[PDB]
Design a protein around this ligand. Structure first.
Ligand SMILES: CCCCCCCC(=O)OC[C@H](COP(=O)(O)O[C@@H]1[C@H](O)[C@H](O)[C@@H](OP(=O)(O)O)[C@H](OP(=O)(O)O)[C@H]1O)OC(=O)CCCCCCC
Ligand SMILES: CCCCCCCC(=O)OC[C@H](COP(=O)(O)O[C@@H]1[C@H](O)[C@H](O)[C@@H](OP(=O)(O)O)[C@H](OP(=O)(O)O)[C@H]1O)OC(=O)CCCCCCC
Ligand SMILES: CCCCCCCCCCCC(=O)OC[C@H](COP(=O)(O)OCC[N+](C)(C)C)OC(=O)CCCCCCCCCCC
Ligand SMILES: CCCCCCCCCCCC(=O)OC[C@H](COP(=O)(O)OCC[N+](C)(C)C)OC(=O)CCCCCCCCCCC
Ligand SMILES: CCCCCCCCCCCC(=O)OC[C@H](COP(=O)(O)OCC[N+](C)(C)C)OC(=O)CCCCCCCCCCC
Ligand SMILES: *[C@@H]1O[C@H](CO)[C@@H](O)[C@H](O)[C@H]1NC(C)=O
Ligand SMILES: *[C@@H]1O[C@H](CO)[C@@H](O)[C@H](O)[C@H]1NC(C)=O
Lengths: 511, 446
């Protein structure tokens, strides 16, 4: 069992290596297939666009201390290292919203207390490295065993819902920035960005997003549909998302006068704010000595960041590596955590962001590599992630190509990923059953062995938990969301059995 | 009453759609008011006097395309369009009088599935083409450019490009189509109670129209073309026509040559009406006579597009009530004026795509791409070689293409006649290519 406490220290790490690394040649060789190239192309945008957006947001929140270039270099390097040495190479490491919230909060704290923000991050990274060495030594990751389908699916459904809602929020922001008006001030300055309302930008962006989503879904149906020869049908379907990107990008390109926001990458491989910092951060201090009390007091934020990264990455790995996804090469819970957090700490030493495996993107990477016969198999390899990381790193040199990619096309892609991520989740299935008559419920054990109203009460409790988590996320106490998620684990083990019989829980909540 | 509401809305939506289409195409000589009043009066007459109350008289795509072709022909010939229509109606009343003396039972049998499927596919294709051509027209009239003249006058019609009209029109049309298709899927879905689900699905077109109309309404600044409805019961364009079109011309005396030659367009109108009724005797005579009388007042011809004693009386009164409500619809001018044209064209495209489902020619066209493994278990798959079935489909596609060119070139009025020319092909020329068994499987009564 991958989750078992062995007497020997660092047992999880060594068994993880001994279980996965023998498959290295197979991992290298299994990437020789068109589906792998299509997944590479899809995940490249799926990971670069969030990277660019979060880098820009980080640059705005901080005094340009950490910006787009830093995040892009961190993502490229960490992705390459994880793909080459990761136990589960299908995971894709990247920045996340909670990490952005933590870095703005730590920035505010450091500014209030007068410390150096980047040096504080360096010390947080040192603390993270120490904590993870300690945890992996004692095989702490085994606690992830207690995370059942209940918590896994609540987390995954919530994350997908936030993804979709945020994409729609970006569309709404595009509309607000350029409201539909009778008259628009022409010859508006656009040097920093459009400084005022513009004509046809909002509606054209909406059309591009809708078209991209429609074409992606239609090509997916074509992949699952019966028309055309099987080989050509599947080849076209695997490249469905890339084909949609190409079609909508060309459609935008041929429109020569309307303005659609384009994906912009940093000018070159340089620190975003050269005056503020260099490439390497001196732990003692860039301009002033770092207080000793902070050297010792970074343990609390370091533990908070460790909890954030641990819960997200481990729950993402659990979701990705479920038995129903037909993963044979196995998965790693100790080596992956060690790699992710240690690389994050080393990056902090270099003034670069720390990343975590991200759920919508990891699930999308796994799905793009899934071969449907039911799921016949999954093309597990280390080349797709490595190529995605290399492309993310080289994006700075791919400015001419990337300047022609609208942001609305990527919004449509994000909607596609958010919609398709909801498919293999029992919580979503039961939510859908909330509207179907009991006559139409499928043939699943939790339907026959559990009365309709009892399972609907289960789904209602899960929906209440989802609402509570969303309220917490909206509240300025957002960084406490993971801990609230931990409160779900007792709920299944303590409170729910007081209301639900053992057989009903076993049928509804099963591995 | 639920039934009289269903039919009332299902008649209003095509009525307003076709009225807008014709008012756009015919320069508002034939508009929404004409279609609404014609449908009301003719439905009253059909219910009170018709043999089959179930058959409902309403404007149809074949008649719309014929009227477009006749309008174009009148424009080229410099003849007044409505007067030519009333003379066509005169020839039609003479023809319907003739039909009484001479039985036409065999004519019903002569038309086969070949012609019916070709015709239905052609009208669906015409619908789709029109919804895309109107989209292209809107985009051309209001291009996408960096700067627009902001003092443009919109009194007769927007005299220059407008900022967001084109993309908003595309959005409204696509949204109407998507909503209609999604509600159609919902009708057969497993969600919600069966009765509520079926009720919502039946009102798919009205619900989509309402949603997109509200979407347009809440957008104030942007301008989208709106269906034009006279405030009262009056005619479409006062400058154009009166309630009683005078034979021998309104502005210029009607040519005598067209007086004599109206028979051929009347013959093609009768061909279209006959064939449209066939795919769905005394009822046809009543419809043709009512259309001929209507042509005098400038109202359009309407075909029975769609198809113990106490139940018959109930059907009669229900048809009468729906006709009366359709007639009174014009008194709802505000709401109709709020309705855009993008929504109506979206519903047009929805109908065009939906009509293709039943047609077997569409099924064969789809099968052309499908590998022979996935071909269905239908008799014309098992008992006919894929090569022969594909040859049948190809010949039908050639017939459709020839009909399309006939539509495109100036000799568009011949479109019905050429369609009838498929009957010889099926009866005479095809049996040479195909054996009796293969022909019977590929096309059949059922
Ligand atoms: C290189 C490009 C290849 C496409 C060229 C097109 C090649 C072509 O025209 O013949 C293929 C196909 C018939 O395929 P065909 O009878 O040979 O059946 C194929 C073959 O028998 C396989 O064994 C089938 O698997 P299975 O053992 O039965 O389970 C496989 O189906 P699938 O189970 O694998 O799905 C089939 O591919 O014909 C079409 O209708 C496609 C219209 C395409 C016309 C569209 C043109 C625009
Ligand atoms: C606004 C509704 C919001 C959705 C609420 C959730 C909608 C929802 O869950 O529906 C199922 C539920 C139970 O329905 P129920 O078990 O009684 O079964 C339904 C119906 O009563 C018949 O029993 C079924 O047909 P049949 O004669 O037996 O063959 C029919 O199936 P079909 O006709 O489809 O084949 C079913 O529609 O309906 C409600 O009563 C509550 C909603 C009432 C409101
Ligand atoms: C995949 C398809 C998704 C469909 C949903 C589209 C979301 C639109 C967001 C509206 C933005 C907003 O709220 O508009 C804010 C601003 C006003 O600016 P303000 O006064 O500052 O607020 O309005 C505008 O100028 C735009 C007017 C509303 C446009 C509505 C378009 C609806 C299209 C629907 C086709 C299905
Ligand atoms: C295909 C893979 C993606 C592309 C990656 C390209 C990286 C380019 C780096 C800049 C050029 C250079 O080497 O930096 C030159 C400076 C000059 O020194 P100074 O700053 O003036 O002092 O050297 C340094 O201080 C150390 C530079 C460290 C760069 C580390 C970046 C990657 C690891 C990030 C943490 C995980
Ligand atoms: C499946 C697709 C459904 C939607 C199809 C929409 C077709 C519209 C074609 C108009 C062509 C035209 O004729 O436009 C001509 C005008 C004339 O402008 P100009 O003189 O060249 O100056 C500049 O240019 C335009 O207004 C802009 C033309 C590009 C609009 C592209 C919209 C694409 C939407 C794609 C949604 C998937
Ligand atoms: C870099 O940071 C410094 C901090 O003092 C500040 O001038 C500003 O935030 C940045 N300067 C730039 C981007 O020129
Ligand atoms: C109204 O009808 C007259 C009749 O000749 C025509 O000239 C005019 O263009 C029409 N106007 C509109 C807006 O349809």
């Amino acid at each position: 069992d991958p989750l078992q406490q062995t007497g020997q220290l660092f047992g999880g790490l060594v068994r993880d290596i001994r279980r996965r690394y023998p498959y290295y040649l197979s991992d290298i060789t299994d990437a020789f297939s068109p589906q792998v190239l299509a997944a590479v192309i899809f995940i490249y945008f799926a990971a670069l666009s969030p990277a660019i957006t979060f880098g820009g947001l980080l640059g705005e929140k901080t005094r340009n201390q950490m910006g787009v270039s830093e995040l892009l270099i961190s993502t490229a390097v960490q992705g390459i290292l994880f793909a080459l040495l990761g136990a589960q190479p299908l995971l894709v490491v990247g920045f996340s919203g909670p990490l952005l919230v933590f870095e703005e909060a730590f920035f505010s704290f450091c500014e209030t207390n007068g410390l150096e923000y980047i040096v504080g991050r360096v010390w947080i990274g040192f603390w993270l490295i120490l904590l993870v060495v300690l945890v992996v030594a004692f095989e702490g990751s085994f606690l992830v065993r207690f995370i059942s389908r209940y918590t896994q699916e609540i987390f995954s459904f919530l994350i997908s819902l936030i993804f979709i809602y945020e994409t729609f929020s970006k569309l709404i922001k595009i509309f607000q920035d350029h409201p539909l008006q009778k008259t628009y001030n022409y010859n508006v300055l656009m040097v920093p960005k459009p400084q005022g309302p513009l004509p046809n930008t909002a509606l054209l962006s909406l059309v591009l997003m809708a078209g991209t989503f429609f074409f992606a879904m239609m090509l997916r149906k074509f992949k699952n549909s019966s028309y055309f020869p099987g080989k050509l049908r599947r080849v076209i379907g695997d490249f469905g998302v890339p084909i949609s990107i190409l079609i909508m990008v060309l459609v935008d390109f041929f429109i020569q006068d309307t303005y659609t926001q384009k994906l912009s990458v940093p000018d070159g491989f340089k620190v975003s704010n050269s005056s503020a910092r260099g490439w390497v951060i001196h732990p003692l201090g860039l301009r002033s000595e770092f207080p000793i009390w902070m050297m010792f007091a970074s343990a609390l934020p370091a533990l908070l960041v460790f909890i954030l990264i641990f819960l997200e990455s481990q729950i993402t790995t659990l979701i990705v590596s479920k038995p129903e996804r037909k993963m044979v090469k196995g998965s790693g819970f100790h080596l992956d955590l060690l790699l992710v957090v240690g690389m994050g700490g080393v990056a902090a030493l270099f003034g670069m962001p720390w990343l975590s495996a991200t759920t919508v993107r990891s699930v999308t990477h796994a799905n793009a590599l899934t071969v449907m016969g039911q799921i016949q198999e999954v093309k597990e390899q280390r080349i797709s992630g490595l190529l995605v990381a290399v492309l993310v790193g080289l994006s700075i040199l791919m400015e001419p190509i990337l300047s022609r990619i609208p942001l609305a096309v990527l919004f449509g892609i994000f909607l596609y990923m958010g919609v398709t991520s909801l498919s293999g989740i029992q919580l979503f299935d039961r939510i859908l059953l909330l509207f179907k008559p009991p006559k139409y419920h499928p043939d699943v054990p939790y339907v026959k062995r559990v009365k309709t109203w009892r399972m609907h009460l289960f789904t209602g409790i899960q929906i209440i938990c989802l609402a509570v988590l969303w309220v917490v996320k909206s509240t300025p106490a957002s960084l406490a969301l993971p801990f609230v998620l931990i409160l779900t684990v007792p709920l299944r083990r303590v409170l729910l059995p007081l209301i639900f019989r053992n057989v009903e829980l076993q049928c509804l909540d099963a591995d």
